[PDB]
Design an enzyme around this catalytic site. Structure first.
Site, PDB file in Angstrom:
ATOM      1  CB  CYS A   1      -5.504   8.192   3.158  1.00 35.05           C
ATOM      2  SG  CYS A   1      -6.640   6.972   3.883  1.00 35.05           S
TER       3      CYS A   1
ATOM      4  CD  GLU B   1      -2.951   0.840  -0.327  1.00 28.22           C
ATOM      5  OE1 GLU B   1      -2.906  -0.242  -0.972  1.00 28.22           O
ATOM      6  OE2 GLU B   1      -3.544   1.874  -0.735  1.00 28.22           O
TER       7      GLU B   1
END
Length: 181
Positions: A148, A72
């Site tokens: 994020c 990720e």
């Protein structure tokens, strides 16, 4: 308010930019030279906005471990006219648990945001939005949409970037020194 927030602030003030892709605005950590990181779900293309400046992407690599499992983390090299302060000596060498972490975010929506998230667990495997993901750190704070790419630090270490949450916990992808040799 204390030495944890002091280290976090020093990283935010010199080593972050606001990155915009077609998938939103993200906190983006600059690591050295023109090399930065962003969550892979940002879907970086050939062009990205950096502090609202149209910027060519010279290289982008979605990292996977040697089991070919998502990490990720995307490493981006930016066609930017300025280098980042080199912070690679603040990166951990190994997977670890931590005490007393701060998650720091800087976007249009959440400027100068600092969250004391507390104890950080080496969680390991997470099914993140349906994608099997390794090297996940977990903290017990109800993180939200807009955080994020947020930077996770302890005093003296930059340990991860925020990549998701389940409404009660938040999850970060590890940063390791070996990613940036």
């Amino acid at each position: 308010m204390g030495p944890g927030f002091d280290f976090a602030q020093a990283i935010m003030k010199k080593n972050t930019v606001i990155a915009r892709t077609e998938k939103g605005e993200f906190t983006m950590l600059g690591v050295y030279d023109r090399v930065a990181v962003i969550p892979t779900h940002a879907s970086v293309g050939e062009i990205i906005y950096i502090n609202d400046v149209e910027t060519r992407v010279l290289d982008a690599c979605a990292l996977r471990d040697l089991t070919d499992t998502n990490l990720e983390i995307t490493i981006v090299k930016l066609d930017r006219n300025q280098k980042f302060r080199d912070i690679r000596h603040f990166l951990p060498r190994c997977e670890d648990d931590y005490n007393d972490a701060v998650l720091s975010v800087h976007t249009s929506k959440f400027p100068n945001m600092y969250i004391p998230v507390g104890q950080v667990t080496n969680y390991g495997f997470l099914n993140l939005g349906g994608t099997p993901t390794h090297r996940i750190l977990m903290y017990n704070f109800p993180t939200r949409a807009g955080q994020c790419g947020g930077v996770v630090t302890t005093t003296g270490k930059v340990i991860g970037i925020h990549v998701g949450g389940n409404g009660a916990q938040g999850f970060a992808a590890m940063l390791l020194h070996s990613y940036f040799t």
